[PDB]
Design a protein around this ligand. Structure first.
Ligand code: HEM
Length: 176
């Protein structure tokens, strides 16, 4: 409860062997493919029908390290932190603070996670499960697709609109 559960992308966790480290209190399951980010805050504006939930914690993936024992000088170095979900009438998305080294380049893809023009995923709540009981709200198995920014974070290894892991989050009605 009071958390976001999301694995980002199943095949990416398999390719990378999962995050080299969990950041800022985020947790991971035993198989390193499902992450849990604690709820920082949640607001719902009735008139605009906009729900916004901010979570804490991050994942750091590293691969192709020149010093493999200490994970230093890694050609693949991806951080995804403080996920924020916006579920609204005009569109639903996942935003996050990202830093990702680009494939065959010195360029680093960055995203501060506070720019509404640069979401990393688009969310489709039409067929997701929604439950509210005993003051607890859970919105489960919400499908997610990669946006243009999300594709850039993965060095365009995936096309735009390719699938991501579905997400689940929960909060108490008292926190609204
Ligand atoms: C610079 C050296 C790199 C080499 C030699 C390399 C090699 C490969 C190979 C052989 C695959 C195919 C296996 C698979 O799809 O699981 C792959 C997949 C992938 N690579 Fe890397 N890669 C490099 C860097 C990067 C970087 C910098 C990124 C950026 C995030 C990246 C992201 C990906 C992604 C997203 C996939 C798809 C994995 C999946 O979902 O299965 N790669 N890479």
């Amino acid at each position: 409860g009071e958390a976001l559960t999301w694995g980002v992308r199943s095949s990416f966790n398999n390719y990378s062997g999962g995050p080299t480290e969990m950041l800022d209190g985020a947790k991971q399951n035993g198989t390193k493919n499902r992450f849990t980010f604690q709820l920082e805050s949640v607001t719902y504006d009735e008139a605009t029908e906009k729900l916004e939930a901010k979570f804490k914690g991050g994942v750091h993936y590293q691969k192709y390290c020149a010093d493999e024992a200490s994970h230093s000088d890694c050609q693949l170095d991806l951080k995804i932190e403080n996920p924020r979900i916006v579920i609204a009438k005009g569109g639903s998305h996942v935003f996050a603070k990202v830093s990702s080294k680009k494939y065959q380049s010195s360029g680093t893809y960055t995203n501060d996670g506070e720019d509404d023009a640069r979401p990393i995923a688009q969310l489709y709540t039409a067929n997701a499960t929604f439950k509210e009981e005993d003051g607890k709200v859970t919105w489960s198995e919400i499908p997610a697709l990669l946006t243009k920014d999300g594709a850039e974070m993965f060095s365009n290894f995936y096309p735009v609109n390719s699938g991501l892991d579905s997400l689940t989050f929960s909060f108490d009605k008292s926190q609204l």
